[PDB]
Design an enzyme around this catalytic site. Sequence first.
Site, PDB file in Angstrom:
ATOM      1  N   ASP A 250      -3.628   8.716  -6.409  1.00  0.00           N
ATOM      2  CA  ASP A 250      -2.923   7.453  -6.621  1.00  0.00           C
ATOM      3  C   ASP A 250      -1.552   7.509  -5.961  1.00  0.00           C
ATOM      4  OD1 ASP A 250      -1.961   5.067  -7.500  1.00  0.00           O
ATOM      5  OD2 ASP A 250      -1.709   5.715  -9.595  1.00  0.00           O
TER       6      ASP A 250
ATOM      7  N   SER B 287       5.211  -5.187   6.131  1.00  0.00           N
ATOM      8  CA  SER B 287       4.271  -5.666   7.126  1.00  0.00           C
ATOM      9  C   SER B 287       4.910  -6.791   7.925  1.00  0.00           C
ATOM     10  CB  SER B 287       3.009  -6.179   6.424  1.00  0.00           C
ATOM     11  OG  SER B 287       2.121  -6.820   7.306  1.00  0.00           O
TER      12      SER B 287
HETATM   13  C1  LIG Z   1      -2.577   0.030 -10.718  1.00  0.00           C
HETATM   14  N1  LIG Z   1      -3.305   1.277 -10.447  1.00  0.00           N
HETATM   15  C2  LIG Z   1      -3.283   2.279 -11.552  1.00  0.00           C
HETATM   16  C3  LIG Z   1      -4.113   1.821 -12.779  1.00  0.00           C
HETATM   17  C4  LIG Z   1      -5.436   2.526 -12.734  1.00  0.00           C
HETATM   18  C5  LIG Z   1      -6.617   2.322 -13.426  1.00  0.00           C
HETATM   19  C6  LIG Z   1      -7.750   3.103 -13.218  1.00  0.00           C
HETATM   20  C7  LIG Z   1      -7.690   4.126 -12.281  1.00  0.00           C
HETATM   21  C8  LIG Z   1      -6.498   4.328 -11.589  1.00  0.00           C
HETATM   22  C9  LIG Z   1      -5.378   3.553 -11.795  1.00  0.00           C
HETATM   23  C10 LIG Z   1      -4.006   3.595 -11.165  1.00  0.00           C
END
Ligand SMILES: CNC1Cc2ccccc2C1
EC number: 3.4.23.22
Length: 330
Positions: A35, A199
């Site tokens: 992430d 962008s």
């Molecule tokens: C906004 N993205 C966040 C929230 C989320 C939910 C499920 C799996 C990953 C993540 C990261």
Amino acid sequence: STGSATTTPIDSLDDAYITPVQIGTPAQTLNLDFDTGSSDLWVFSSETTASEVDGQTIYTPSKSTTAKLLSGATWSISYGDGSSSSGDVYTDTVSVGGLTVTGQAVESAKKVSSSFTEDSTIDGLLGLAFSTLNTVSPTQQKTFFDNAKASLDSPVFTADLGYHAPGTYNFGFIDTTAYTGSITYTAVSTKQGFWEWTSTGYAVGSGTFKSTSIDGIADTGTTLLYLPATVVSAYWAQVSGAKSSSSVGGYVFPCSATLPSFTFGVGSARIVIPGDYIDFGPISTGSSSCFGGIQSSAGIGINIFGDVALKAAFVVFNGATTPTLGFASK
Ligand SMILES: CNC1Cc2ccccc2C1
């Protein structure tokens, strides 16, 4: 050093991607959601409230000879979709695709919200935004990338997400066979802790390119592409029968439609998202209304270049002293 790991969609819609991560000694392999929009490495664990675990693989620190409680440290995070998790902290050895960090903070969940429980394929998250967003208290902790950076051949990682197919996260090198043409680099602001960039504009289908600055974040942990309401309206106006539905929570379109592409600018370069990448399928099983992959950011406070956009490119997260982002077609 370098590392290279395959990342795999969790479902037929590419709702998220999971990458295997080795934690502890002997290794415990968990499938984490990498992430670039957050900065905590947290896992389902032997400490997670039992009623909140439903099929996930758990980390058990007591079975790792290299795990050490980070005494007094706690963490608690809330994400943009309303989900959340919290717990305590261990340090342990963490390896991704052959790249090893010792002493990495591994945040053990005691509690997770229902959306995490309900997703049996995601065993936790591995944050790759800037460490200034890490939630550990009272001593903030570094991300896996920040800990690895000095050892890497080059202080970079790359995201090469697949459309309905596996892709790759690389650490420490840029695979020049993985993209076409050249990589266009663009400035990053770290002031909000994100890989935030601007962008240079957009086009819908074969339409003319509109030059306009769109500030947003490169976020592998967000599924969709969230852009200003003006841009999103211009896109969906090209799809017969598409409309914004308050009951569903965004733009929907007839499943019988053929969607146009969407182009976004990176400096003078252009990344083309094929129309098929924008189809997220029936809103409920059997429905002929389909959910759109480009949605308004109006209620969010930031534009988000999530997986829909990033999977159309080879993306370089350059963590040099002045960070930058790179995008290439592929
Ligand atoms: C906004 N993205 C966040 C929230 C989320 C939910 C499920 C799996 C990953 C993540 C990261």
